[PDB]
Design a protein around this ligand. Sequence first.
Ligand code: P5Z
Length: 135
Amino acid sequence: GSHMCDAFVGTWKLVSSENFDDYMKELGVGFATRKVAGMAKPNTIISVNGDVITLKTESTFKNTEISFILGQEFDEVTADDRKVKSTITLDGGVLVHVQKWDGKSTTLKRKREDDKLVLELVMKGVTCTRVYERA
Ligand SMILES: Cc1nc2ccc(Cl)cc2c(Oc2ccccc2Cl)c1C(=O)O
């Protein structure tokens, strides 16, 4: 059968970024990692096997991989090496990813808009948008 996650499945490459440096500062990312991360053009591969969604991100300097069930909290190590407790849910057709660590929180929303995969990353007052297109 068809699922709301179907539209996300596939291989994606970064095409544009807005306010990523500010967002990384809010996360506590240091100067050098901000420079190196800002240069990268990651690929993200989203796949589904039964109820398990896998999201991989590959880049020149860092690869990440999470597998999860919607609504079930899990341990995640982020690209900037935060050790977080994460939960990912569907809100309509938007994947909502909340990461909690040291009493802090950031929310990452993934949505399909036109032929793009749009990521909205929010920490305190700062919103970054990262746009991906099919690879
Ligand atoms: C959502 C997201 N969050 C990030 C959080 C922190 C950093 Cl340093 C990179 C991030 C990042 O880029 C990367 C994610 C993995 C490897 C490399 C990069 Cl630059 C993404 C992203 O666009 O998927």
